[PDB]
Structure formats: C-alpha cells, structure tokens
C-alpha cells in the first residue's frame, strides 16, 4: 500500500534511524499538504516569458512540475525524505522553459545564501537540461568545490547525457530513470539518457506525488526529473544523519549501496553499454571501508597521436589506470601528474578508431600516492618496476609503448618494449593482494573478482597476447576484453 | 492544400522497393523539426511507423526506413508485401502554425495480381417496391481485378443516362474489387419496355445482364 | 495496455454543438501532451488541436479557431473537445493521440492513437431504411435485400441472425444525389435449398434505432 | 586567447544575449569596469547594449544583451576568458 518507487529505494535490511535542499524549477504550490510549512518560496525568479501564441493563463497549471518534485523529495506521505526542509527558486516559466543565464543567476543566489546561513549541508536539485554549456558546467563545478551536493536529471532524450548540461558536469550527480521492472524508462519514443556522464538510475516512471490541483491531491508523473528528485531525497537523508559527509564520500556511498546489474543493458546502444553504470539507487544503511569507482574518459578521437584522459574528484586518489579500444589498436596508458594531481592518460595507435582512458578513483584517507616508471628493457624477463619504499603498496599497473610490433610481491611486469608504471600508496593499514584468472580459449572476455571485504583497485591483462582490446573494472570485477589471456586484479582493504 | 506535400499515390509489385517523398518549407522540416510517418490500413486508426526521421518502433519491420534532408523527407519500403497496402502520412511541427501538421497522404497500391473478370448479378424491381410506387434495378459487380469498370444501362436497346448512380470500386476482403449500380425508374417506365440491361465493361470486355417485367 | 478511447460522436445540425471526450488508461497521462486529429470520409488526416500535460501550451488549427475549445482533466485521465458552431465541413472521424511532453524541447511523434469517434454535421435528420426483398429465380442461386434511403451511415446486415455467413456479400452503399444512402446485401445459396431453407435478412440502422427483418422467398 | 561558445542544438540557441566569462581571480570591480568598457566601445560604433547582470561569487563576468555583430569586439576585451551565447533549458 506504499508506492512502488519508495519501496524500491528502501533496501532489505533498512533501519529508520540541519540539511537544506534547494529546488531550481517552476513555481510551486507551497500550501499543498505534502509540503505545507516545510518548503519556503525564496523571492528568486528569473524566467523567460511564455510563448503567448500558445499560452492561456486561465487554463495553465504553472505549479504542476515543481510542486510534484518538491513532494517527491520531501512530501509528508509520498516523499523520500519526509518533512525535509526545502527552498524553491523559480528558473522555469509556466511552459517549463528557462535560460542558462537565469540558471546561473540562480546558482549564484544559492552561493550567496550559503555564506549567510550557518554552515551546514546543502543539496541543490536541478531537474532540467539544456545543451552542453561550458559556463553552466563551470558554475556547477565551482559550487561543488564549495561543498554543495548538486543533483540533476540525466535528460529525457534517449541520448548520450554528455551532450546535455548540467547532466555532463562531472561533479554533479546525474540521475537516469528506471521503471518498476528496473528497466530504462521510455518517454514517448525517447526516454532516459545514458552514457558515461550518468552516475546512477532511480525510479522515474509512474511516480505518485503532490498535485497542485488542490492541497490534498496527488498525481503520477514520469521523467528523469522524478528520478533526480529521488536521489536528492536520498542525499538529504544521508546528510541529515552524517552532516559532514563530503560530496566525494556521498557519491561513493551512493554508488556502493545501489542495486547492481538489475538493468537489461540491451536497451542502450551497443557502444554505450560499457559506459553506462548498471546501478539503481537505494538508501544506504550508512551512519558509518575502502570505496572505489570507475571513471571512463571521453573517446580520444581518430587522430592517431590523440590521447584520452580520465580524472578523479579532488578528494580522491587515482589508484590505477587502464585503457580500452573496440578494435584493440591502442598504445596503452600512463599515469601522469597534472597540476600536482595524478591523471590517467591513454594513447592511440596510428590507424583507425580512438581509445578510452579508464581511471580507478578511491577514497583513501591520509594516503600519499605516487607513480614509478621504468623505460623499456629489451630483455626476456621484460620491463619491471616495484614499490621500493617501505609501507608503500602497489595498487595498480599501467603500460604504454611506441609501435605495434609486440610478439614472442608488489611488482609490475610489462612487455620488453613498453614503459611500465606502478601506482604506489602509503596509507595506515593499507593491504593489497593480486588475483589472477587465465582462460585458454578467450570468448571475448576473461574476468576475475575480489572476494567480499576487498576492493578492486587495479585491473590488467597479462602481457604477451596480441588479442587484448583492453581492461576495465566493473564494481569489484576486473574485465579483460579479447578479440590464452589472463586477467590480473589488485585487491585492497583497510585494516 | 496541405503544408507538407506528398505524392497522391505510389505502387509496386511484391518484392519491389518504393519511396514516398514529403516536402515542406523553412517553417517546418527546414526549421529543424523531425518528420514522423504513420501507416493507416483501410478502416483502421493511423499507427506510428517511423519517428524522428528514421527510427522504427518495436514491431515495425526493417523493410521500412526513413530519411530527412533539407526541406524534404523520404519513406522507403523494400521487399514490398501485400499487407503494406495502406495510406501513408508524414508529419512535422510547423512553427508558424504552432501545430504538428500532416502531409496530404499517399495511397500505396500493391500490384501484380492476376486479372479477374467481374461477376455481374442483376435484380429487377421487387413487387413490394412497385406497390410502393418506385422501381430500382440493382446491378452488383464483384471479384474483378484491376479495379476500374464502366457501367452502361440499356432500355431495350437504347442507352439510359438518367437515374443511374454507381459506386466507386472498393476492395473486398478477398483482395478483388466490388461495385454496384442502381437504375431508378417509375413503375410505368419499368412496365412499358420489354427489357433493361446492365452492361459492365472491364479491360475492354463487356459483361451484360438483362431483366424483363413479369 | 496503453489505451485511448474517444466518445461523444453523433449527428448534429449546422450551428449546433458537441462535446467529445477521450479516456486514457495504462500510462502516466499527466506527463503526456494530447491532440485531436480528424479525418473526413475518404480524406487525409488534419490536425485540430493540442494541449500540453499541464495545459500551458494550447493551439488550434485555423479552420477551428474560435469555435473549438480543447481541455483536459488529469485527475480524471480525460481529454475534451468542445465543438461549437459546427459546419458541414467539420464532418469527420475525430481521433485523440498522445505525445510525450518535452516542454517544447522536442516535438515527438503521436505514438498512440485512439480508434476515433464519428461526427456528422448535416441539415438532414436521421432516417431509417426501407428494405425490399431481392427474390431469387441445380447449382447456386443469388438472393438478397435492398436497403434504401437511409441516413447517416452505417447499416449492418446479417442473415438468419448470424447463422448464415458463407456466401454473404454486403456491398458498400451508394450516396444518392438526394443525400441519402442505399446498399444491397446478397447471399449465394444452393438452389436446391430454395423453398425449404427460409432466408431472412436482418437490417440494423443504429442512428435511427431501426431494426428490420425481411424474409426473402422465391418467385 | 578568448573563445566563443554556443549551444550545439540550433533550435535551443538564444542569440543576442551573452555570458562574458572573465579570467579566474578577476575582482568584481574589474568585471564591473570591463562591462562598462564594452558598452562604451559598442556605443561608439552605433550599438545600444544592456548589462543585465555582473557576476561575482561563483564566476567572474557579466550578462550582456547585444548584437552578435559585437562578438569580435567583445573577445578583445581585457580579462576575457571566453564568451557563451545564452540558450534554453527545459523541465525534464
Ligand atoms: O579596468 S579598465 O576601465 O578597462 O582600465 C584599464 C585600462 O587598461 S586595459 O583595459 O588595456 O587593461 C586603462 O586604460 C584604458 C584607456 O582608458 C579609456 O579611455 C579607453 O576607452 S573606453 O571608453 O574606457 O573603452 C581607452 O581605450 S580606447 O577605447 O581604444 O580609446 C584606453 O586608452 O589602464 C588601466 C591600468 O592602467 C586599466 O585598469 S585594470 O587593472 O585593467 O582594471
Ligand atoms: Na555527472
Ligand atoms: Na511524492
């Protein structure tokens, strides 16, 4: 007798035991019984005028979209974070249209009001999308660096979310929509966006919530707006119980406690299936492990000295770096410093497609990490490198070379003609071990997983095989992709 | 008189490839709005066939494809099948009308079936209708292909032009054509002549039926 | 099962009024725009009017501007079309169709349609048919009944209350210059059965609430 | 060098309004003066312009309503990092 979507984000072993949520959307019906007295209408309003040739103010329900979303986040009976406190800003007109420039002015208003109210956690819900905007993504990043949790809709266009903003801003939590069968929502002939800029999915079809028709009325709605509102509710409950969760910690926990592999990825275009996280959001038991996430770069492009680069959040360490090419014409990957922070750069061959760089990004408190490299050796034992300093643990191995004529504890081994790069980290109680799995007849992929209690930090293929497309981590499983091949996982934990 | 222009009809034999064009203007197709296509089988509601210039809904075979270029769009059907006989409509938003307007429609005809001569049945006026002071002769024409006939009525041996109403040929459930022709007479006209005849010409061959008063 | 069911069609005199309604089920109605499209008999589809999910976009074909009013009621999963000052050229089947509301960011296809409701605008009142037997005279014989001077369409014809289906051919009606319709239904039967099997055509003209049963006898 | 940016989706473009983003560390008084300098340069060429907003706090720069003719001029202003053409966002 409770809405399917509220049940869906509530995990099996759920135990129900200061945060401001800002909503940038249409006007809202603040009198509605779901939100009465818990949502305050700020005086912020910056919207373009309606298209008057189609606008009949007498008939229009200007409050319908925002009221429903406020109810999904914090409604008394049907909300995710019931009774949570909210502040609404109007950046969409009655016809659901706004501007990048008005949205920026709304984000600046949030920044101003953050410096005035007592310091505390704030969530900003952005249930809107336009085309990729450099300025809008930059404003979102600057707010994220001030400790704001930004949550946004992936977009409703059955398209790559990286073409939309603020969906494409990396530090914003980008939410796609799934239905009661945990499949991607279709909306008309389109539906939820997908791709490497989506962080997770959440219920976004047939979502019951406050209707501005009347103060006690309810209505079902569908879209990635509704899904983002679910994750903003989840964030608000997490931050209500742990007010000094950082955004980075919050994002890793959202990823970690989501339902895995419940989506049939055949819905997505083939070349987006590896880029799109198979995650449906759920409330983490939380209230408090080594958390890691995979970060795919953009495709490098068919220039054949072109590079792809994958980066971690500021609070995270880059523990390993791999690469992938759909036809295997790559020159490997390299961990390198850029402004005193360590990035993952993959290199293209010299004919054809392009490459992805794939970073493994982890929350490792009080860590001091570094990369150590060895030039190509030209020796039968190959190129070797290892973490010489005491208490420095090997978390990942990278390898890049120069031209494609390759064919004949705590250490990295690579081809004779390749440079080899070791990620080494010092952290209290960090311990790591290697697991391997080899298959003589590789049917496209060989995998190996870390046991429960361990976290996959590094994923790699054993060198000396011309039939390797690349390697990447999927949660705690190392995945090597072939056209005898061995997958090599590095698994770590903390005390 | 529609904003999007389609050819009135197209045709092909089973297995052929046919195309249907849709041309608009800078306020619709040329303004960046997508073209969607609908198929209407005889006596059914339209159904979605192609969305967004070129996307196929679930359940539409890959024989159907669409493209868009400039101010024009095109629907292509390969491997034409008999069940593809239908009306096709393109559609696009038009920003000066603020609505998603439709092309005039294209009637697709599937050709190639063997010729078939019409069956003709001719009924005289019933005595009940004569008692009501009217007289209708009823010429029924069925099972013919292709679907064009001309009907001529004879009073004895001379042509009758007045009082004739003939339907347009339409397809039966067996994929051949049917039509009917009605000759209205006064009872005195019916009784005064010795015969009336319905002459049906199909592909240059005439079938004739004759009735006489009793 | 996504479904749209329109209702409210009928026969009306010029200058009159009708209210169509459209009931939706099986989907999240409040996130979809809704549309009316009409089709005059033997003619093309004509867009009539559109209303967005929150009614903040409303538009009308020029030909109906100022006479038709679209509205919706999301709590009742219903769409409406109030039609005033009807003219003969408004005669048509009226379909409703949905399109997901992208708030003008994208104009999607009408991806689900209803079956349509028929609207006739005519200065003529409804008239039930006169029906006459078409008597036959050892292979097969043809007999039928003539269904004369009715309005508007349709009439249905059955034989022996549906127990005789093989050999039945009911022809499409002719539209007379008078504005009334006539059709013929014929059945092909064994001539040996004549005068042993009795044959009855059952004519149903719902617009006028007329049923006629006519037995067709040889000679 | 200063670059110009616009929405890739052509029907979502809103030409005639521009966000001028100044280099990081630019102070409010310099954004304020850069906006007034753009207005004065454009007025000398016969163009009316409107400063709609001067940003400070999130990013430094300003919002200007003006003719696209002036983009080349605006790109040469001191402190400019890049200029973005306004565009639409939509309820999802
Ligand atoms: O902050 S500013 O008002 O832009 O002043 C700075 C300017 O130098 S700079 O913009 O090249 O960095 C200034 O001298 C500019 C001088 O003053 C005006 O008259 C200007 O005309 S205008 O009507 O203001 O546009 C003149 O240029 S012109 O239009 O080609 O005739 C011009 O010669 O110098 C100071 C520093 O000494 C600048 O201050 S700041 O540190 O850049 O804020
Ligand atoms: Na993101
Ligand atoms: Na709700």
Shared-domain flag, residues A395 and A405: yes
Burial class for A288, CB neighbours closer than 10 Å (0-12, 13-18, 19+): exposed
Residue C107's DSSP bridge partners are none
- H or E stretch including A372? strand A368-374
Mutate to test the pocket of ligand 1, among D78, D79, D80 (most ligand atoms within 8 A of CB): D78
Mutate to test the pocket of ligand 1, among D33, D49, D54 (most ligand atoms within 8 A of CB): D33
| 3-class SS of residue A294 | strand
CA distance A365 to A248: 12
Structural domain for C55, as ranges: 1-123
Query: Left (φ > 0), alpha (ψ -120 to 50) or beta: where does A169 sit?
Result: beta
How many domains does chain B fold into? 2
Considering only CA atoms, which of A271, A275, A356 is closest in space to residue A310? A356
For residue A379, give both structure tokens.
């020796």
B172: phi then psi, degrees, rounded to nearest 5: -85, 170
Compute the distance between CA of residue B116 and CA of residue B49 in angstroms, rounded to an integer. Answer: 33
**Pairing outcome for strands A392-400 and A419-426:** antiparallel
Task: Residue D10: list chain B partners with CB under 8 A.
Answer: 32
Kindly state whether residues A302 and A250 are assigned to the same domain.
no
Are residues A328 and A193 located together in one domain of the fold?
Answer: no
Q: Is D15 in the pocket of ligand 1 (CB under 6 A)?
A: no
Q: Give the closest ligand to the alpha carbon of residue A170.
A: 2
Which of A267, A288, A309 is the last residue in one of the domains? A288
Structural domain range at position A463 = 289-495
Any alpha helices (H) in B77-133, and if so which ranges?
Answer: 127-131
Domain co-membership, C10 together with C61: yes
- Domain match, A254 and A336 both: no
Length of chain A counted residue by residue: 495
Domain of B88 in residue numbering reads as 1-112
Quote the CA–CA distance of C104 and C58 in Å, as a whole number: 12
Rounded distance from Cα D50 to ligand 1 centre (Å): 20
Ligand 1 atom 31, closest CA: D41
- Chain B closest CA to C185's CA: distance in Å? 10
User: What domain range is D34 assigned to?
Assistant: 1-88
* Residue that terminates a domain, selected from B112, B134, B153: B112
- Classify residue C17 by burial, with Cβ atoms within 10 Å: 0-12, 13-18, 19+: exposed
**Residues A76, A210 within the same domain:** yes
Q: What six digits make up the tokens of D90?
A: 């939509």
Q: Are residues C113 and C26 in the same domain?
A: yes
What is the rounded distance in angstroms from the CA atom of residue D19 to the CA atom of residue A140?
15
The string of DSSP letters for D34-72 reads HHHHHHHHHHHTT---EEEEEE-SSS-EEEEE--GGGHH
Residues B132 and B198 in one domain: yes
Is A85 tagged catalytic? no
Please indicate, yes or no, whether residues A253 and A385 belong to a single structural domain of this protein: no
Question: 3-state class of D31 per DSSP?
Answer: helix
Question: Is D37 near ligand 1, meaning CB less than 6 Å away?
Answer: yes
Query: Is the same domain home to A391 and A254?
Result: no
Question: Which residue lies with its CA nearest to atom 18 of ligand 1?
Answer: D37
Instruction: Exactly one of A225, A419, A423, A460 is catalytic; name it.
Output: A225
Structure tokens at B207: 């079938």
Q: Is A189 on the interface with B (CB under 8 A)?
A: yes
Asked if residue A323 and residue A271 are part of one domain, the reply reads no
Query: A210 to each of A424, B8, C62, how far by Cα in Å?
Result: 52, 50, 36
Ligand nearest to the CA of A207: 3
- Looking at the structure, tell me whether residues C111 and C22 fall in a common domain: yes
Domain match, B105 and B171 both: no
Q: Report yes or no: B147 and B135 within 8 Å, Cβ to Cβ.
A: no
Same domain, B52 and B72: yes
**D40 in ligand 1 pocket by Cβ < 6 Å?**
yes
Tally of domains in chain A: 2
Is the domain of C94 the same as that of C31?
Answer: yes
Beta bridge partners of B87: B40, B107
Residue of B nearest to D9 (CA): B32
Q: Among A268, A288, A308, give the residue marking a domain's end.
A: A288
Tell me the three state secondary structure of residue A282.
Answer: coil
D28 lines ligand 1 (CB under 6 A): no
**Chains A and D: how many Cβ contacts under 8 Å?**
104
| DSSP character at residue A195 | S
- Distance CA(C208)–CA(A418), nearest Å, equals 90
Report which secondary-structure segment, H or E, holds A488.
strand A485-494
Nearest to A417 by CA among A374, A358, A467, A466: A374
Alpha carbons A33 and A30: distance in angstroms, whole number: 8
Euclidean distance between CA atoms A383 and A9, whole angstroms? 48
Separation CA C11–CA C24 (nearest Å):
24
Entry resolution (Å): 2.3
For residues A112 and A209, membership in a common domain is answered with: yes
Based on the fold, state whether residues B52 and B81 are members of the same structural domain. Answer: yes
B26/B130 same-domain check: no
DSSP SS3 for A238: helix
The 3-state DSSP class for residue A352 equals coil
Same domain assignment for residues B1 and B102? yes
The residues that bridge with B19 in the sheet, in sequence order, are: B76
User: C10 Cβ partners below 8 Å, 6+ apart?
Assistant: C18, C119, C120
CATH number where A478 lies: 2.60.120.690
Looking at the fold, whether B51 and B70 belong to one and the same domain comes out as yes
Same domain, C10 and C96: yes
Q: Are residues B108 and B144 in the same domain?
A: no
Separation of alpha carbons A422 and A396, rounded Å: 6
Give chain C as a 3 state SS string: CCEEEEECCCEECCCCCEEEEEEEECCCHHHEEEEEEEECCCCCEEEEEEECCCCCCEEECHHHCCCEEEEEEHHHCEEEEEECCCCHHHCEEEEEEEEECCCCCCCCCCCEECCCEEEEECCCCCECCEEEEECCCCCEEEEEEEEEEEECCCCEEEEHHHCECCCEEECCCEECCCCCEEEEEEEEEEHHHECCECEEEEEEEHHHCEEEEEEECCC
- Breaks in chain B, named by the residue before each, with C–N above 2.5 Å? none
Read off the DSSP letter of residue A30.
T
If asked whether residues A60 and A197 sit together in one domain, one would say yes
Take residue C118 and report the two structure tokens written for it. 């028929």
My answer on whether A275 and A313 are in the same domain is no
CATH of the domain at C151: 2.60.40.10
What residue's CA is closest to ligand 1, atom 10? D78
How many domains, in total, are found in chain D?
A: 1
Report the length, in residues, of chain C: 219
Look at residues C123, C156, C173 and tell me which one is the last residue of a structural domain.
C123
Which among A258, A288, A318 is the end of a domain? A288
Same domain as A314, residue A235: no
Query: Could you report how far apart the first and last alpha carbons of chain D are, in Å?
Result: 36
Q: Which sign, positive or negative, has the C-alpha torsion D81, D82, D87, D92? A: negative
Catalytic residue from among A32, A63, A64, A65: A65
For the beta sheet containing A39-45, the strands, ordered from the edge strand earlier in sequence to the opposite edge, are A39-45, A86-90, A20-25, A122-126, A149-153, A173-178, A200-203, A279-280, A259-260
A100 contacts D58? CB cut-off 8 A: no
Q: Give the residue from A242, A245, A83, A223 showing the smallest Cα distance to A156.
A: A223
Q: Which residues contact residue A443 at a Cβ distance below 8 angstroms, ignoring those fewer than 6 apart?
A: A482
Q: Is B56 exposed, middle or buried (0-12, 13-18, 19+ CB in 10 A)?
A: middle
Sorted by sequence, the CB contacts under 8 Å of residue A378 that are 6+ apart come out as: A416, A417
Of A458, A459, A462, A456, the C-alpha closest to A418 is A462
Subunit contact C171:B52, Cβ cutoff 8 A: no
Q: What SS3 class is residue A76? A: coil
Distance D67 CA to ligand 1 centre (A): 22
d(CA A292, CA A231) in angstroms, rounded, equals 20
3-state secondary structure of B131: helix
Tokens of C78: 């219903």
CB atoms within 10 A of CB A45: 13
3-state SS class at A315: coil
Solved how?
Answer: X-ray
Q: Does residue A31 come out as left (phi exceeding 0), alpha (psi in the -120 to 50 range) or beta? A: alpha
CA angle, D31 then D34 then D39, to 5°: 130
Q: B152 and B192, same structural domain?
A: yes
How many Cβ atoms from other residues are within 10 Å of residue B82's Cβ? 10
- CA–CA separation, A158 and A397 (whole Å): 36
Q: Which of B202, B206, B154, B204 is nearest to B178 (CA)?
A: B202
């Amino acid at each position: 007798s409770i809405p399917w979507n509220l049940e869906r984000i509530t995990p099996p072993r759920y135990r129900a035991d200061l945060v401001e949520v800002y909503l940038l959307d249409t006007s809202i019906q603040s009198d509605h019984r779901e939100i009465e007295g818990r949502v305050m209408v700020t005086d912020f309003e910056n919207v373009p005028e309606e298209d008057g040739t189609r606008f009949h103010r007498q008939a229009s329900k200007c409050d319908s979209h925002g009221t429903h979303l406020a109810g999904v986040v914090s409604g008394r009976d049907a909300g995710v974070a019931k009774g949570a406190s909210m502040r609404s800003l109007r950046v969409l007109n009655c016809q659901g249209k706004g501007t990048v420039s008005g949205t920026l002015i709304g984000l600046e208003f949030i920044r101003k009001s953050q410096l005035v109210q007592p310091v505390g956690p704030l969530v900003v819900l952005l249930p809107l999308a336009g085309g990729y905007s450099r300025v809008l993504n930059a404003a979102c990043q600057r707010l994220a660096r001030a400790g704001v949790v930004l949550v946004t809709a992936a977009g409703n266009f059955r398209d790559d979310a990286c073409l939309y903003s603020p969906a494409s801003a990396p530090e914003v939590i980008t939410v796609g929509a799934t239905n009661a069968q945990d499949q991607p929502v279709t909306l008309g002939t389109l539906g939820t966006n997908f791709g490497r800029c989506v962080d997770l999915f959440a219920p976004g079809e047939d979502i019951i919530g406050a209707s501005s028709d009347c103060s006690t009325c309810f209505v079902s709605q569908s879209g990635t707006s509704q899904a983002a509102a679910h994750v903003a509710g989840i964030a608000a409950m997490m931050l209500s119980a742990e007010p000094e969760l950082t955004l980075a910690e919050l994002r890793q926990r959202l990823i970690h406690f989501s339902a895995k592999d419940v989506i049939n990825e055949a819905w997505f275009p083939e070349d987006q299936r590896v880029l799109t996280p198979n995650l449906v959001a759920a409330l983490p038991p939380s209230t408090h492990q080594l958390f890691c996430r995979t970060v795919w770069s953009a495709h490098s492009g068919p220039t054949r000295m072109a590079t792809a680069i994958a980066r971690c959040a500021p609070d995270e360490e880059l523990l390993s770096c791999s690469s992938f090419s759909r036809s295997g014409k790559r020159r490997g990957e390299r961990m390198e410093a850029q402004g005193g922070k360590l990035v993952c750069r993959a290199h293209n061959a010299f004919g054809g497609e392009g490459v992805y760089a794939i970073a493994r990004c982890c929350l490792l408190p009080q860590a001091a990490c570094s990369v150590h490299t060895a030039p190509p050796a030209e020796a039968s034992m190959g190129t070797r490198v290892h973490c010489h300093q005491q208490g420095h643990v090997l978390t990942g191995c990278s390898s890049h070379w120069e031209v494609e004529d390759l064919g004949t504890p705590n250490q990295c081994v690579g081809h004779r003609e390749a440079s080899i790069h070791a990620s080494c980290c010092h952290a209290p109680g960090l311990e790591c071990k290697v697991k391997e799995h080899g298959i003589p007849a590789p049917q496209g992929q060989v995998t190996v997983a870390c046991e429960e209690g361990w976290t996959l930090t590094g994923c790699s293929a054993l060198p000396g095989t011309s039939h390797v497309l690349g390697a990447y981590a999927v949660d705690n499983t190392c995945v090597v992709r072939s056209r005898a091949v061995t997958a090599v996982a590095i698994c770590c934990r903390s005390r | 008189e529609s904003v999007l222009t389609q050819p009135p009809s197209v045709s092909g034999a089973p297995g052929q490839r046919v195309t249907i064009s849709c041309t608009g203007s800078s306020s619709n197709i040329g303004a960046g709005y997508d073209v969607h296509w609908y198929q209407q089988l005889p006596g059914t509601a339209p159904k979605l066939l192609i969305s967004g210039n070129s996307n196929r809904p679930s359940g539409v075979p890959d024989r159907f494809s669409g493209s868009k270029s400039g101010t024009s769009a095109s629907l292509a059907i390969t491997g034409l099948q008999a069940e593809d006989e239908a009306d096709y409509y393109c559609q696009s938003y038009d920003s000066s009308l603020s609505g998603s307007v439709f092309g005039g429609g294209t009637k697709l005809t599937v050709l190639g079936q063997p010729k078939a001569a019409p069956s003709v049945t001719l009924f005289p006026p019933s005595s009940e209708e004569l008692q009501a002071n009217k007289a209708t002769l009823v010429c029924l024409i069925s099972d013919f292909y292709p679907g064009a006939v001309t009907v001529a009525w004879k009073a004895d041996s001379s042509p009758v032009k007045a009082g004739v109403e003939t339907t347009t040929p339409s397809k039966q459930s067996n994929n051949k054509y049917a039509a009917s022709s009605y000759l209205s007479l006064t009872p005195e006209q019916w009784k005064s002549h010795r015969s009336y005849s319905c002459q049906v010409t199909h592909e240059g061959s005439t079938v004739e039926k004759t009735v006489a008063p009793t | 099962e996504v479904q749209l069911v329109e209702s409210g069609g009928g026969l009306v005199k010029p200058g009159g009024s009708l209210r169509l309604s459209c009931a939706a089920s099986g989907f999240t109605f409040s996130s979809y725009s809704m549309n009316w499209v009409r089709q005059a008999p033997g003619k093309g589809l004509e867009w009539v009017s559109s209303i967005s999910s929150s009614s903040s976009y409303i538009s009308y074909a020029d030909s109906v501007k100022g006479r038709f009013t679209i509205s919706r009621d999301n709590a009742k999963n219903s769409l409406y079309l109030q039609m005033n000052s009807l003219r003969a050229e408004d005669t048509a089947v009226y379909f409703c169709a949905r399109d997901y509301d992208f708030w003008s960011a994208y104009y999607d296809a009408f991806d689900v349609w209803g079956q349509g409701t028929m609207v006739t605008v005519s200065s003529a009142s409804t008239k039930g048919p006169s029906v006459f037997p078409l008597a036959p005279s050892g292979g097969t014989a043809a007999l039928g009944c003539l269904v004369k001077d009715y309005f508007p369409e349709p009439v249905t014809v059955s034989w022996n209350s549906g127990a005789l289906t093989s050999g039945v051919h009911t022809f499409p009606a002719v539209l007379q210059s008078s504005g009334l319709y006539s059709l013929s239904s014929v059945v092909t039967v064994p001539s040996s059965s004549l005068g042993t099997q009795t044959y009855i055509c059952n004519v149903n003209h719902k617009p006028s609430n007329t049923k006629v049963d006519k037995k067709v006898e040889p000679k | 060098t200063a670059t110009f940016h616009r929405c890739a989706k052509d029907p979502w473009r809103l030409p005639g309004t521009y966000v001028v983003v100044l280099k990081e560390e630019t102070h409010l008084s310099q954004s304020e003066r850069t906006a007034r300098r753009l207005q004065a340069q454009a007025a000398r060429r016969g163009y009316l312009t409107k400063i709609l907003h001067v940003f400070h706090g999130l990013l430094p720069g300003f919002l200007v309503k003006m003719s696209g003719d002036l983009l080349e001029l605006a790109l040469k202003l001191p402190h400019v990092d890049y200029i973005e053409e306004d565009s639409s966002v939509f309820a999802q």
